[PDB]
């Protein structure tokens with residue numbers, strides 16, 4: 001809904017602080033990592049699937065971070 | 073003098089070329105200008121007022137659905153037809169139920185059904201917009217040589233209170249005792265309105281992007297739409313429950329207010345209640361100091377025996393403040409303020425309230441100054457009543473050059489290309505730096521916008537890693553300007 | 568810098584306004600109208616161009 | 617849906633008084649169409665101001681006016697004795713129609 | 726040198742249809758619109774008029790769109806009001822009003838000046 005597209009990458013920022021910064025700056029990492037610790041099997045699945053495709057050793061890490069980050 | 077105690081200071085110095093200097097000043101930043109003559113002033117932008125806005129689109133937050141009714145029709149002989157499907161108040165939805173002999177129709181197939189309920193409203197928001205004329209900036213100019221109890225206060229007038237519009241002029245500020253300062257401020261290129269919508273919920277207000285505000289899914293209404301019945305995308309605040317293949321029904325989706333305060337993570341909050349005041353943004357200035365007096369010539373030098381009533385207090389990067397109080401005769405007089413080393417041979421460290429005087433002897437005077445790194449001996453008065461006070465500014469080094477570098481890159485992070493102000497037209501360095509910074513700015517923006525705090529660091533690690541593995545000396549091409557710069561911008565955003 | 572379009576705009580019958588038209592350049596330019604007292608100086612910014 | 621200029625206004629000769637009128641965002645709030653009509657009672661109404669601040673030939677430069685969003689004004693600088701007539705405002709909606717205000721009869725003593 | 730004279734009706738009882746006329750003189754009648762306003766003695770100006778041209782189009786008021794109708798003839802250079810179903814509160818002075826149509830013949834946007842030149846004012850009463 002409107003809780004998505006949260007008006008972040010607009011520019012428009014000045015030295016005075018925003019509406020909720022220092023709270024909504026670490027919400028997405030906390031959200032996806034409580035998702036990881038409450039749904040680990042998709043992270044194992046993304047580890048095997050990420051290790052299989054993507055030959056070079058950096059593509060495993062990039063595809064693994066992106067696959068565990070798209071699924072919330 | 074309103075500038076002491078504010079953690080953002082930005083000392084600017086140099087009236088070179090003609091008699092002007094470029095400064096750019098924010099709301100939470102009070103700027104102090106120094107010169108070889110031309111006494112030190114303090115500039116603080118206190119408010120921005122947009123005068124007459126006109127709303128363009130009225131979204132709504134919480135609604136309710138009344139007069140709910142439904143209508144169905146037999147299989148294969150067409151859609152239903154409800155009488156109040158003709159109003160655009162009633163939100164409509166066609167779907168298929170299962171019908172048969174038990175429902176009283178025949179043919180045993182999937183019928184058609186329609187459902188309507190009148191969509192009223194309870195809570196709106198107004199998106200008000202302005203054009204970059206008819207709005208003023210209030211700016212205060214407080215001179216130094218502080219009288220009794222005027223250091224960092226905002227209550228009570230101590231400086232001139234000039235208003236500046238895009239309709240304005242030279243804007244002479246006639247300071248009493250001092251000269252007359254003129255400011256060629258440019259408010260049109262300051263904050264870039266016409267891409268800003270002054271959003272206004274129940275008792276708060278923000279400053280949102282225009283294209284963000286138009287792409288916002290809630291049932292809206294045009295800003296000129298009196299008798300606001302025809303809500304347009306009503307299907308983003310209703311839902312149609314058809315669980316089985318039976319009777320469907322409407323239920324309202326609830327108040328979208330708490331999901332709207334989460335929509336605004338990045339909108340700088342403003343005040344739209346008895347005035348459309350803003351307290352964000354900036355403007356650059358052209359600060360002309362061709363006519364300024366020091367107020368202190370034809371005041372004879374003092375005859376000693378001063379007395380301190382507020383001690384040396386280093387307020388925020390070595391800009392100490394003393395409040396002496398004078399005892400003696402010949403009360404209109406300059407004071408003998410000098411800062412020496414141990415034995416009185418060399419003068420170290422400038423004075424910031426240049427030429428401090430005494431008026432009305434039983435009233436103290438504030439003296440701000442800047443000591444060097446190490447031992448300094450603050451000296452007031454003459455030899456029968458000498459005050460040789462000690463101060464040790466906590467001895468740093470070129471560490472203030474590295475924190476002036478970090479302050480400068482910080483100001484290039486908040487201000488994009490206006491940050492090449494605070495300089496009085498170096499020319500081949502200042503204008504070429506501003507020009508190439510506008511070229512590299514518009515290839516950064518509109519090719520890296522929309523992403524946030526995390527994704528800038530991720531893409532910056534991707535660009536840094538690609539640069540550390542390429543050939544044909546494109547290593548330093550993809551690190552020094554797009555890698556580490558996007559990590560620094562990646563950590564300085566969300567201010 | 569900046570071309571005038573309404574060429575030599577004149578005042579006739581002083582108590583009647585006069586409308587002037589010119590082309591500012593691609594940056595910000597300044598609109599000088601008066602001369603020594605009350606030199607009616609204005610700011611205008613222009614995008615892209 | 618008429619404009620909201622007041623009942624009446626008074627002024628000594630030589631003063632500089634104002635006459636205000638409010639409206640909505642379709643009447644006055646967006647458009648630069650606001651006109652004023654002086655109407656002596658045994659006389660057809662004569663227009664005093666064009667679109668917002670302009671002025672007909674023959675009308676003296678005593679009459680002026682401005683707009684502040686939904687509100688338009690009329691300031692008569694230097695009241696003489698011959699301003700003893702009511703002033704009707706005017707506008708043009710976005711809808712296409714024409715509205716006039718209530719009327720402010722102005723006495724000079 | 727622009728003169729717009731009218732004609733006055735004496736007394737119309739409620740129910741009868743009444744029409745007034747304006748003789749627009751001094752300009753090209755086919756390239757200027759013709760508005761109609763009214764004024765009761767001691768009250769406002771409300772707008773009755775429509776938007777004439779060489780075309781002959783209309784735009785009536787929202788209050789009494791179902792009350793008035795038109796006719797005109799450019800050979801006589803006169804525009805005619807037609808107010809049928811006269812009522813008790815309808816005692817008012819009817820003023821004539823002109824403004825200029827577009828150069829494309831139609832009347833889409835008005836000129837910035839509306840009513841620079843006027844009429845006389847036609848009084849009707851009831852009994």
Ligand SMILES: *[C@@H]1O[C@H](CO)[C@@H](O[C@@H]2O[C@H](CO)[C@@H](O)[C@H](O)[C@H]2NC(C)=O)[C@H](O)[C@H]1NC(C)=O
Nearest residue numbers: 074219220221222223224225226227228229230
């Ligand atoms: C900021 O300035 C105001 C204005 O002078 C100071 O308020 C004065 O405080 C003295 C204290 O003795 C009173 O006698 C005055 O009547 C006050 N003046 C007013 C209220 O207008 C205020 O103290 C200053 N603030 C600081 C922190 O020095």
